[PDB]
């Protein structure tokens, strides 16, 4: 290893994590990323779960935030764990069908990029359009990077991405756990913790609940 950051200062890190991935702090106490093929898979899995969890915590909080602020949606005040029972123009059936067809397309595209990097950088129809060569799996760029980032700043930005994404994955785990234990919305849990933080610890609530 080296003088890189570490999840535990002084700990003898495993070594196969040597900074080349974003957010490398040596945390692999179960040695799940020991084999480089499993590590190449888990890097992309981390990126994907991370980005989807970031989107999810955004779409759970900022609706909750906009509703507690007092804006008007048809879908305001409906909990994130109750938005499926909500009625829309289509039943959830057709929504899952369309979702899975479209995601089959784009996820098989992403998987073709992962299997053979540099392959899915081209449109079916408009071949004038393409993604810039030299990209990595998980970081397509081009039309996925339209606002003009990735020129410099890229290691800083990848570290930022994976840090916010780990935080968001933990936040979604917390949404699930808090909605299963407290049975309420997450920002209302924040409000009940900020009301009196000393009588609303998880220890306190879980002891009172049994």
């Amino acid at each position: 290893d080296a003088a890189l950051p570490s999840w535990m200062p002084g700990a003898d890190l495993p070594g196969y994590l040597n900074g080349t991935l974003p957010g490398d702090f040596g945390f692999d106490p179960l040695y799940l990323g020991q084999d480089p093929v499993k590590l190449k898979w888990y890097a992309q899995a981390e990126l994907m779960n991370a980005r989807f969890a970031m989107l999810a915590v955004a779409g759970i909080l900022v609706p909750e935030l906009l509703s507690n602020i007092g804006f008007s949606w048809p879908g305001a005040g409906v909990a994130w764990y109750d938005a499926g029972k909500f009625e829309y123009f289509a039943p959830a059936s057709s929504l899952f069908g369309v979702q899975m067809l479209l995601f089959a397309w784009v996820e098989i595209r992403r998987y073709q990029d992962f299997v053979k990097p540099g392959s899915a950088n081209q449109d079916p129809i408009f071949t004038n359009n393409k993604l810039p060569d030299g990209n990595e799996p998980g970081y397509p760029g081009g039309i996925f990077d339209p606002f003009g980032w990735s020129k410099g700043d890229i290691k800083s930005l990848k570290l930022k991405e994976i840090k916010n994404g780990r935080l968001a994955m933990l936040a979604f785990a917390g949404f699930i756990g808090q909605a299963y234990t407290t049975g309420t919305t997450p920002l209302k849990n924040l409000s009940t913790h900020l009301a009196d933080p000393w009588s609303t610890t998880v220890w306190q609530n879980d002891l009172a609940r049994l």
Binding site: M8, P9, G10, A11, P197, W198, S199, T201, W203, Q204, L207
Partner: protein, 230 residues
């Protein structure tokens, strides 16, 4: 050569006198292993420091607030931060600092650096004696002060054990029991409260109840090793 716990004895071969408080006392040979001796040195230091802080704390609590029994002071504070909020803060803060101390114990060159403000760190020190920001105004030589620390700390360890066993037998605090002994020197010893002979055993009953409420539960409050009490 050096003063020993027994002025005529020979210290064990593994106690050469280098350490502070090294008076040749290891009749069981617990510190014979060189790796166990480091851990026991650190445990002696932190036990000494905890016990010194705790003995001073009980004494000063008894002086300032004689209204409260130090043995009962856990269930009599009624702070607005509740029991579990305090317990959580203490758990996490003590976990941080003790894991940091533990990481210095295992790999000593590991943790001298601040994990926030990188410009501040501790100088290369000895394990058990951090220094740096922990030690401003060291008054005099460091070796004699380490000896003083460990001696006052052994005394304070015995003093806290004495607080406990004189608060379970007498039910009174340290200075209250001291005044109880000064008001009756020949009748308030443990020899004058207790005696076992081949045919009967008189033990002092505990003045501590076996259980206390503390907010809707019943905390078991047992005497330390009653039964083995004389």
């Amino acid at each position: 050569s050096r003063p020993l716990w027994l002025p005529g004895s020979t210290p064990p071969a593994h106690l050469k006198g280098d350490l502070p408080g090294d008076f040749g006392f290891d009749p069981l040979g617990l510190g014979a292993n060189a790796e166990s001796l480091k851990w026991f040195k650190e445990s002696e230091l932190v036990h000494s420091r905890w016990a010194m802080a705790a003995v001073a704390g009980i004494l000063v609590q008894e002086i300032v607030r004689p209204d409260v029994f130090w043995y009962n002071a856990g269930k009599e504070v009624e702070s607005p931060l509740g029991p579990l909020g305090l317990l959580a803060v203490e758990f996490f803060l003590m976990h941080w600092v003790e894991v940091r101390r533990w990481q210095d114990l295992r790999k000593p060159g590991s943790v001298d650096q601040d994990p926030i403000f990188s410009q501040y760190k501790l100088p290369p020190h000895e394990v058990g004696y951090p220094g740096g920001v922990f030690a401003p105004f060291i008054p005099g030589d460091l070796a004699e002060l380490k000896v003083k620390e460990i001696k006052n700390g052994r005394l304070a360890m015995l003093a806290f054990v004495g607080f406990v066993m004189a608060a379970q037998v007498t039910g009174k605090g340290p200075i209250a029991a001291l005044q109880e002994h000064l008001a009756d020197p020949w009748g308030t010893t443990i020899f004058s409260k207790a005696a076992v002979v081949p045919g009967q055993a008189v033990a002092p009953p505990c003045k501590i109840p076996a259980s206390v409420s503390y907010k809707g539960i019943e905390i078991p409050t047992p005497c330390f090793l009653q039964g083995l009490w004389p």
